[model samples]
Target: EYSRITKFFQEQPLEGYTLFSHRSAPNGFKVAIVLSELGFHYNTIFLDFNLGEHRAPEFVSVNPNARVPALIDHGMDNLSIWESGAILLHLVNKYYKETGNPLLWSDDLADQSQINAWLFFQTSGHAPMIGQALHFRYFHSQKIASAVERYTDEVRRVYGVVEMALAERREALVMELDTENAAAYSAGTTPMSQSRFFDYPVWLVGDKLTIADLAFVPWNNVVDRIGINIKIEFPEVYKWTKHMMRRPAVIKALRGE
Candidate 1:
């Protein structure tokens, strides 16, 4: 029986694969985060951006452009998607449409539109802003003051926008796990010390955890959650980020469980 299972893995295997920069890069994190949300069995081939691992023959064979976060889909047929946004759209359409969950194709057009619009914005807006936050806060300590001013400023502005959206959406979109399902929300069973508040909606589908919420998590989880001080301040954003992350799949992804 064990050998039969082993042979199955060695032979047929699952479809849906990932080509990504090593974990830690924001672009790669974005792609991996979505895969975690979708529950796909994936292969995260490492691409050392600095050493140019993406330039190697094997990596270039799949993605000639040598970018991280490419996807190789071998389910029905073999197809590759190089850009992150296109890949996100394709997976949601392919898998989620069939699922018929509230996250996809909601009865509310405005909600759906908001979901679509922000899915783009999050990559273009939040990820980059958050990257800048990390860039100055930790990595690029050299440029010092200027980097700090620029990135921290952007981080604050972007976070404020997040705060505003939570205010608008009535309920956190996807309103359940999108709100706080254990699998989706990553905070422990106990309350987090920091506090966060919502003025709009913060779920993935504008009011729910659609592809949009999946677009979040990951990096946001690292920044706003993780280790920190508490009692008065960080709750609103902290709760919102963890609620999205609380998914079982996300926990699996985070710990590579």
Candidate 2:
């Protein structure tokens, strides 16, 4: 039975995929990071937005939204999935399901649901405000100082929410560490290293790193562009993001390695 099970698993074909994406676009980059972390085999089909290739009929048929990071996944019955968040969930459900993915915390349904909510929050509350602010600052033809200031302030507000969330999480981690390592604290072996400070099991979910953390990385990667002071204004988020930055998979995914 064991040998037969191994043979069945080995016989499965789970590799063909292509991501229609750009090099610097955050949404597409997040998808690539997820794929890279899962160790999935896939190719990146870079779209030339400068040449209006994204508006071409062939590309529009795939996404219809004409968005970067659209996916053509052979694993999902050759389905073409658009919207980066949807693509993340689709790949996790189809490919990572029952495969014991370390990047996911799906064994508990409640945890999975929370992860879903956070991903939605990233799309709704986090990414768009920054995008608006970015557009006003860089792409707008007639720069209105009022509009730029308003959107920039909104971006800061969003950052505050994230900061509070991360700060709360860190507080929880510290509490857990206190409970678990009370003796160590008393002896001075506590807080052994900066990396071990909040190196708990899950990150966004609990002690396990989940899709929520991955979802936020791309947007958080650009706080500097908006002239926001992450280190001074949002220390917890800064620490959390720095922690995420240390991941090998994140480095490879974002760097195109």
Candidate 3:
């Protein structure tokens, strides 16, 4: 079983990176976003889920779970990485070291911890709940009202968590102005203090965007399909999602342009 898959990858004209993906898989898109953000040259091989392509022995060698979004890094001696979250971390870490840029990550221990926390939350809580909601509502063989309600409600609950966090970040950004600066601004005596701080976006883990924010994009993009009105119920999350969607990397990843 492993022989074919092993040979298949070995024979490939290995380039930079090769990502096994499917058009409708959100996790695959998530990794693609990170790759695009890093500005890495890579190739995509879209697998056919309906045809059981993902479960074939050849592909199973790459991902034991037979999931889309598995990656093979030719530059790393054909290193194989499965699971979207793990892939994001690897890519961001490599990008950070290679480019001396921490846009999607941070060197500070506290900041790294926060970023990892949110990434874990996204994978363990947000993604699972939304996935379950989708399965029960659309793909399940039978319509189990209880299961659908439970998962969809869980999705709403997770969104509530994100909404509160973002709202808190917004509040903290506003409160950064010291008393003197506030008074000076009120009297029109000086420009608003910490103008640079005001420019920072209200992201999940920090003032700047990170993979923590990108991790949420794939699922958040489809919230409307689950019957949750983010714009009305979770305004802060709605704003954050909108802000992320506008980025060129996100646009290219999601739209495949």
Candidate 4:
């Protein structure tokens, strides 16, 4: 088992950053999105879960939990990082500077706190709940109705939280612009008239897009498979997710293009 894993790496050698992933896993795809958004050149090795490739000793050395979506930054002395959320932060913190854009992060303390908070929510709350819903719905050996209802309800509840936040942000932006316009009108200055606030995309944190927004995409992508009517049930979150899915980097990563 270890020989095959060792031979694979020896043949390829390390180049730039290498991501160990499974093609169907949402967590790995989450990391891929950030890497694509940053326009970073990296290699991806899709492990075969059916073959238990991810559990091989050589691979487990990289991720003690033996999970897909682990990363090794070859440029940084083969520094290994695991966990999708942690990988996103590390990529932005270390490589975003080279891109001349803090692509998916912020330097402001408040914004950073909010960003991390949402990231944590995705990892701990959103992903797990939805994952469990998926498990009981499809993967469980026994069709447990109670388990399915429990997790599915949590999925809806989690989406409600996201929907509320997005709706609130949209309303807040409209109010903010209204106030600005009123001040300009009273001062007899040129009003910065622009498109309606609804025309603009509302992100989870701050005005611009951040890792927090991208972190939710992978799991959200599978809502339909989980038997949830996201579009009807969570309109705000649905729209927000659609906007993100349309982005070039996101499309590229999700499609493995």
In terms of TM-score, the best-performing candidate is 4
The lDDT of model 1 is 0.59
In candidate 2, what residue range of length 10 has the lowest lDDT sum?
1-10
Tens digits of per-residue lDDT, candidate 2, 178-242, equal 57665564467865334356644336775677788888888887978988878788877777777
lDDT of 4 by residue, 1-257 (tens): 34666666566545578888887889988989999988878788887777778777777887898887898887776788988888999998886567666768987879889999999999999999998988999999999999999999998898889889998887667657767465654465743324255546889997898999999889987989878887888877887888999999999998884
lDDT of 2: 0.75
Write the number of the candidate with greater lDDT, choosing between 2 and 3.
3
Task: For each candidate, give its TM-score against the true structure.
Answer: 0.68, 0.83, 0.87, 0.88
Pairs with steric clashes in candidate 4 = none
> In angstroms, what RMSD does candidate 1 have relative to the true structure?
9.4
lDDT of 3 by residue, 1-257 (tens): 23444456658755698888888889989999999988987788877776666667667776788887898888787788989989999998888888898868998989999999999999999999999999999999999989999999998998988888887786567556444466555577765534445444688875788999989988988879989988899877877888888899889998863
Decoy 2 TM-score against native? 0.83
For model 1, residues 160-215, the per-residue Cα lDDT tens digits are 66656653442333333234443433445533212232333355453456767666
Which pairs of residues collide in candidate 3? none
Q: Which of the two candidates, 1 or 3, achieves a greater lDDT against the reference?
A: 3
- Give candidate 4's whole-model lDDT: 0.83
